[PDB]
Amino acid sequence: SVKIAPGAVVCVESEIRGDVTIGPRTVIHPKARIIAEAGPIVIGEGNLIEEQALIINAHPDNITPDAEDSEPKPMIIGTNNVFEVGCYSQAMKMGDNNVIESKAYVGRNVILTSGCIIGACCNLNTFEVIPENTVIYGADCLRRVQTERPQPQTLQLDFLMKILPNY
């Protein structure tokens, strides 16, 4: 159960499990932990994953209520999305143009919008939709600040096309 797409430079040496659905232009780094436990992992074009990044769809393992009839909970991820070093993620719906920082634990049901960044080494288990174009910094406190403009990361992704060959 794999839907590999051409153009996307997913590395074979990275670990993948379950009913995956790979994006057009995604670039997965080695030792990137993607699992499709209950529902599939839907990936948007330009959704690069760097280093350790626990992306699971195991709401049946998390809660295990035996409710919501089927409860597929399909993991939708947006376009131009940077997953940094050691960042845990589990979001059924996730928007485009968002960059979670290194060692950032994202919650069990947290919906990300555009121009929004999670703080480095900051954990957010609490379920709460993030406002449009707002960043979180620090672990001790969240200290939310609205950004002026959304930040794109296209150039970085485009250059990896050249590197990944013979690695």
Partner: peptide
């Protein structure tokens, strides 16, 4: 523990 090089956001050429 991880030791990865950073990418330099240069206008001339973006490289690690």
């Amino acid at each position: 523990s991880v030791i990865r090089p950073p990418f330099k956001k240069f206008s001339k050429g973006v490289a690690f």
